[PDB]
From Swiss-Prot:
It comes from the Eukaryota. Belongs to the integrin beta chain family. Heterodimer of an alpha and a beta subunit. Beta-3 (ITGB3) associates with either alpha-IIb (ITGA2B) or alpha-V (ITGAV). Isoform Beta-3C interacts with FLNB. Interacts with COMP. Interacts with PDIA6 following platelet stimulation. Interacts with SYK; upon activation by ITGB3 promotes platelet adhesion. Interacts with MYO10. Interacts with DAB2. Interacts with FERMT2. Interacts with EMP2; regulates the levels of the heterodimer ITGA5:ITGB3 integrin expression on the plasma membrane. Integrin ITGAV:ITGB3 interacts with FBLN5 (via N-terminus). ITGAV:ITGB3 interacts with CCN3. (Microbial infection) Integrin ITGAV:ITGB3 interacts with herpes virus 8/HHV-8 glycoprotein B. The chain holds residues 712 to 753 of 788 of the full protein. The chain crosses the membrane at residues 9-31. It is found in: Cell membrane; Cell projection, Lamellipodium membrane; Cell junction, Focal adhesion; Postsynaptic cell membrane. The gene is ITGB3. Isoform beta-3A and isoform beta-3C are widely expressed. Isoform beta-3A is specifically expressed in osteoblast cells; isoform beta-3C is specifically expressed in prostate and testis. This is Integrin beta-3.
Amino acid sequence: PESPKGPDILVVLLSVMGAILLIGLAALLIWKLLITIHDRKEF
């Protein structure tokens, strides 16, 4: 209120952006892990 800086709107947003991006990397990596370790004869 006197300082609703609390989280610079930038910080919430900055955290949101990082959080989503970090998850995305993990998502891609397993995808690639599936295929690089050699997905499978899924065929």
